[PDB]
Chain length 134, copies 3
Amino acid sequence: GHMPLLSASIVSAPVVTSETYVDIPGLYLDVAKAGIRDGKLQVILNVPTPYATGNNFPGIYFAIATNQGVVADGCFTYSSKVPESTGRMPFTLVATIDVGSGVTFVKGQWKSVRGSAMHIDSYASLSAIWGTAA
Amino acid sequence: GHMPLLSASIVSAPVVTSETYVDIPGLYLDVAKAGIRDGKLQVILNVPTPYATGNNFPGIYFAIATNQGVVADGCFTYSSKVPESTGRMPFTLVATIDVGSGVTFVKGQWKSVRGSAMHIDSYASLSAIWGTAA
Amino acid sequence: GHMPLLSASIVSAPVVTSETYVDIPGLYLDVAKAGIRDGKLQVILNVPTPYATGNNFPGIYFAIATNQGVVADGCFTYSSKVPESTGRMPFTLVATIDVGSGVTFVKGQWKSVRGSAMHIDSYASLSAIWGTAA
Ligand SMILES: CC(=O)N[C@H]1[C@H](O[C@@H]2[C@@H](O)[C@H](O)O[C@H](CO)[C@@H]2O)O[C@H](CO)[C@@H](O[C@@H]2O[C@H](CO)[C@H](O)[C@H](O)[C@H]2O[C@@H]2O[C@@H](C)[C@@H](O)[C@@H](O)[C@@H]2O)[C@@H]1O[C@@H]1O[C@@H](C)[C@@H](O)[C@@H](O)[C@@H]1O
Ligand SMILES: CC(=O)N[C@H]1[C@H](O[C@@H]2[C@@H](O)[C@H](O)O[C@H](CO)[C@@H]2O)O[C@H](CO)[C@@H](O[C@@H]2O[C@H](CO)[C@H](O)[C@H](O)[C@H]2O[C@@H]2O[C@@H](C)[C@@H](O)[C@@H](O)[C@@H]2O)[C@@H]1O[C@@H]1O[C@@H](C)[C@@H](O)[C@@H](O)[C@@H]1O
Ligand SMILES: CC(=O)N[C@H]1[C@H](O[C@@H]2[C@@H](O)[C@H](O)O[C@H](CO)[C@@H]2O)O[C@H](CO)[C@@H](O[C@@H]2O[C@H](CO)[C@H](O)[C@H](O)[C@H]2O[C@@H]2O[C@@H](C)[C@@H](O)[C@@H](O)[C@@H]2O)[C@@H]1O[C@@H]1O[C@@H](C)[C@@H](O)[C@@H](O)[C@@H]1O
């Protein structure tokens, strides 16, 4: 384990609405367990096939979070107030975290855009590659 | 070659329809040749500018596949049955594979959503970073 | 610094139009400074929440560029000539570069699709992982 790669994957999540970032169940990396105590992690949240349902330009915010909270966030939104059929909108988020700050874990989170119901019904991943500062 | 990075890129592919996952020609990493026999690979399939044509909510499924078959898959779809003009829908898929299972290669694949013709006419990549278990 | 991870992030950029690739201010990795003189870099440009405004199927081209120019590029475009409201269209681009060619830096760049104004008003990143040839 000189060069550890962390990964977690899901294929579904209970459909929820949330005004605040809530964990995506199963997208969680236990960093402490891996013996990562310092250095840097490049974390990728990959949700390649999500959709959102709602009545007001639906979408989903996603975030990468540690113990210390959200490090990076982003969203997709549809370009129609009520899309003919809510299409799949691939989403990727990349963030680099300093593990020494007190990071024990990394997780993926999501939140509604304008009261959207959030849908994962296929593969989604959270991955991390360990490195050093330059 | 202590820390090998694998990469393959294309700029086009013959436009095809397929009911089943078929290789995207040229998105192929010969892992065995690189002397990767165990450990983990973080594989990224990046198709940043695809489009699909069809008459029924067109889209494309994409997959990361090894010798042992599809490890991860996802899709984009338009939100209109027949879009005014089929726009570019960036797509990224990330998967982590155990090389020891008998992985000699990693490839990108695609399949039609609802009989869509699949279009790559610009840069697309398949990349991999080698690591260990934690 | 045996295994260096490079990263840069922004949360906004002045809104501009450009017929040619122009730097996205702040998405810049000083590679030379990190003492990377050879080997390979896997570079990810992550713009998870952009939008474009215009009157003719708006969109944005993005590129990864070194001192030696653009190594990889891609775009998103809307599927309507004038979208009801220009939605957020997550964009990721992945490229692997040979550092020995005279690479001192890596940057993210963008260009208008059909005279689109280019909008970043939230987190965007440029990341790189160092490896060797196989
Ligand atoms: C209630 C309903 O029928 N929804 C369908 C959807 O119906 C379309 C209408 O809403 C539209 O305005 O009129 C057209 C006329 O053609 C449609 O009848 O059709 C989509 C497919 O276009 C369908 O979703 C597919 O469902 C199948 C199983 O039947 C698959 O699981 C397939 O992957 C689904 O398509 C994807 O998911 C949807 C949300 C979009 O993102 C597509 O672009 C993807 O390809 C709708 O079906 C519903 O949603 C499904 C996920 C499922 O939960 C069904 O139980 C539900 O009816
Ligand atoms: C048959 C045709 O003319 N298709 C065009 C498309 O026409 C539009 C109509 O379908 C629409 O409903 O009405 C409007 C009125 O303005 C249009 O006339 O226009 C697009 C550009 O908007 C055009 O695609 C561009 O073609 C050029 C070369 O002319 C470039 O290669 C450019 O990158 C193309 O745009 C992209 O690709 C298309 C598919 C979309 O994803 C855009 O959002 C991208 O920016 C259509 O042209 C066709 O498709 C091209 C790929 C090419 O194969 C042409 O030979 C073909 O006419
Ligand atoms: C001028 C204007 O009002 N633009 C709004 C937009 O208005 C819609 C109309 O253009 C449409 O055709 O009719 C509907 C009727 O409901 C709307 O009134 O609404 C969007 C939200 O739907 C709004 O953008 C949001 O603005 C807030 C602050 O008020 C937030 O910053 C929010 O994140 C914005 O939404 C996102 O950004 C826009 C561009 C889209 O990508 C959405 O899908 C995202 O969720 C428009 O507001 C404008 O753009 C904002 C970025 C901001 O600069 C405002 O000052 C400007 O009015």
